[PDB]
Subunit: 310 residues, 3 copies
């Protein structure tokens, strides 16, 4: 046989929904004046903050948010649901255009809890891997540890997801599939990295001034990546939108509670692999259900397709 | 339109069943020579003491006790089940005569755990609110902290149920419904308040002498209400029955175990609202399944009914 | 009526499966060149090591292992499933030849958790009791505390299972059925008792030399039974097979990890009652799914049968 590169459009989204049910149309996030994606990868954090969900019970929030996402996908294409995976509040959805569904194979989904006692699901990661035509793809959604001072724990959460996440494989003989053994890796989530050094007022001033380049110089994810403690070999696109945390629910105002939290680029998307081009990377201010704003990126990704023989 | 007051009969019952399945006919509690209630409000504590129930799993005890209650309702009327709500061992049931069912609306049920780590369901409250004709009603069933020395925690459990219990409402714009925003509030449960100061032998002697007025002078709920720490604006009827805890299972004898627990009026019913009259308040000694006896009260409650226009 | 003793063949098996799904045919354990048993008693430990199973959720491992066992039963007889009981990873299955099913009655199953905080199901026991013809039988499967130094906790786990395990009974009037109130008791499990005194190299040398009599002189279960701290009145057959823990998964090699665990006869079967004869007691090295090997015993057991009147 013979293969060739054919480009497909992948949408990746991440949204921390603060334990809320969906109240708004999600088109403003998932299909806001874009061309129809070929593949949708849609991730949530904090789907359900209840004690019942924490102890691994089913939750109506799973179906509520799945339906909201399905209804918010681009109207020009029929999308097939390929896979849903959830650990407590961390949920990842994979859809493809119906016409591409026949070329999806080897779908596997797994989860890793890195929260209470290092194991519970209040924080951690979920992942879906699959083959699209002849290209292997893994999408990871992680919610890493909270608070500015806990960057070392965020680094450890990342390392633990990478080492513990193992996928099934057709051949029991080879070692299990890990996240890294894929042609294309998309990593999204509330990575929860904050702004070092600067005080809250200075952070807010830089944002008002739209000096995102200066603010980004103090971003913990940037610093840790530069120190090679996390996300080795991954790329992140330039941040041209304002921090996505923390807002008063129902508004675009920064947290006016007593805690008065410093804004942060909590919500991020990164990638690794050949033939990837990021076409956009943005937040969606119009959605106010949560104290975070959703983030999205659209990629053109080259996929190995088998040429038809005649 | 025009409204007028029409009286309906409400039965309220509370029973701590010590993790047991039902073994006796519940008519002796629920329909023991009384007129048929229009509305039944039936609450349990300790429905299931298992670790599985504690971690929020379904339990066969829910259906066993629901059926026992349904079978024990007054035989002269067909009762419609309006709502069931359970948190671990705390369950509340609401029924109305079939003929009144069409005038029930806006039924909402919620729970608040105030047990382990302040959040688990070994203690706490559940509630059902609804509109009957044009009158709003909230029924609360609480199981508050154990032991004579923990009255401050019982006070805190009450305050926490009051502040955390929020109900849905037709209009997202107004603040959520709380327990206090109702025309009629009925609060029942194992409130777990004990007798201060007196030693066990003195308590038992007063009960033998049927001097309930003297024993009540040392009741913690009375004292805390007088200090305005709990149940502000609520009324409780005079206690004319002997303490309902703690008995040897299968008997009317006081706890003969090594612990030799002091008797207490653990199990109580209180109310708040206009046009309420208590017609009775009693315990039911004949039921011996548990180490508590069940308590009941019947009220005449004035309800706002729309007058028919012709 | 008149009764007489008739002998039936009972198979008992215990297998700690290290949280794995079944990968091998279980005939090598359950029907490896033996006559068809009349009754199968098949016990597992560590069916599922997940946090979800630990908090008492259903697991697909239950059905996977039940089907594997059913498929591995002796092919000459149709076996009826009488009962399945599971607590977290501890599962016991009871089957009988179809032709004997009509003579099984009073089947009851219960569990006792003796793990975290003395109550959780990471360790403990499950049991099935029943009447076969006119003889009462109780089969217990226990997973007792780990590690050489914790023999006192293993003793306590045993005592706690014995005192807490209570079965339902036709007559509410008599005291509940306990394990000890049965004509025949079969106790199996990962009892987790280790070899005292000897160092790892010496243990391995004795095993190489096949000097099981000398190694057994240092076995903790033997010592504790002799001290009358556990298993009073029970018998165990001579151990003529090598220790069943701890192996590298997929091999017959001893644990080559850093921990380098000493081999132990973790997995045991004991009995108590009249008219019992052990016909075999062995391990099954050929099964390599787990870090333990399965153990089996076949008994001839005299059962009281009602003579037919003509
Ligand atoms: C081994 C099993 C037994 C263990 C039982 C222990 C139960 C328990 O303590 O969980 C605690 C867990 C903690 O949240 P965690 O994931 O750090 O995530 C939150 C962060 O995302 C931030 O947003 C912080 O809030 P903000 O930045 O202030 O907005 C932070 O709040 P705080 O600063 O207050 O830490 C925290 O709540 O909360 C939950 O997951 C909620 C549901 C479980 C609770 C029920 C059980 C009691
Ligand atoms: C964050 C998650 C992890 C937390 C795990 C922690 C698990 C745990 O310790 O729970 C303990 C919980 C305690 O009972 P709690 O509600 O005070 O209610 C009981 C009172 O109503 C009284 O009747 C007292 O008994 P009496 O007056 O003497 O009759 C009292 O007994 P004690 O005096 O002995 O305190 C107590 O049992 O018991 C239960 O709810 C039973 C079921 C859960 C246990 C399984 C988990 C191990
Ligand atoms: C009151 C409720 C809240 C309590 C939450 C606490 C959760 C928790 O710490 O559990 C711990 C529990 C411990 O295993 P436990 O039964 O001793 O059994 C194992 C033994 O059988 C041996 O094989 C030992 O391993 P090896 O001989 O080395 O092979 C030993 O390992 P270690 O030597 O390392 O002790 C141990 O894992 O592990 C589990 O059961 C696993 C699943 C639950 C964990 C999820 C919750 C975080
Ligand atoms: Cl927007
Ligand atoms: Cl009575
Ligand atoms: Cl073998
Ligand atoms: Mg939140
Ligand atoms: Mg009790
Ligand atoms: Mg193991």
């Amino acid at each position: 046989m013979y293969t060739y590169i054919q480009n497909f459009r992948f949408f990746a989204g991440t949204y921390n929904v603060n334990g809320q049910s969906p109240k708004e149309c999600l088109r403003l996030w998932l299909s806001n004046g874009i061309q129809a994606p070929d593949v949708y990868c849609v991730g949530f954090q904090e789907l359900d903050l209840s004690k019942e969900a924490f102890f691994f019970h089913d939750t109506p929030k799973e179906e509520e948010w799945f339906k909201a996402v399905s209804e918010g996908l681009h109207p020009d294409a029929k999308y097939a649901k390929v896979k849903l995976i959830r650990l407590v509040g961390i949920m990842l959805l994979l859809y493809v255009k119906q016409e591409h569904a026949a070329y999806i194979s080897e779908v596997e989904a797994e989860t890793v809890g890195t929260g209470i006692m290092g194991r519970m699901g209040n924080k951690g990661g979920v992942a879906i891997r699959f083959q699209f035509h002849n290209t292997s793809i893994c999408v990871v959604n992680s919610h890493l540890a909270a608070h500015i001072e806990e960057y070392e724990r965020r680094n450890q959460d990342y390392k633990d997801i990478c080492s513990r996440m193992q996928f099934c494989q057709p051949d029991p003989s080879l070692p299990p599939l890990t996240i890294s053994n894929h042609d294309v890796i998309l990593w999204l989530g509330d990575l929860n990295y904050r702004i070092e050094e600067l005080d809250v007022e200075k952070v807010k001033k830089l944002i008002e001034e739209k000096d995102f380049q200066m603010l980004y110089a103090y971003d913990q994810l940037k610093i840790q990546v530069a120190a090679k403690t996390v996300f080795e070999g991954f790329t992140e696109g330039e941040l041209t939108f304002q921090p996505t945390y923390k807002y008063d629910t129902g508004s675009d105002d920064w947290d006016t509670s007593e805690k008065c939290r410093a804004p942060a680029w909590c919500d991020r998307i990164l990638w690794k692999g050949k033939n990837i081009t990021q076409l956009s990377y943005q937040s969606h201010m119009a959605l106010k259900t949560s104290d975070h704003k959703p983030v999205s990126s659209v990629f053109d990704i080259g996929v190995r397709v088998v040429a038809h023989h005649h």
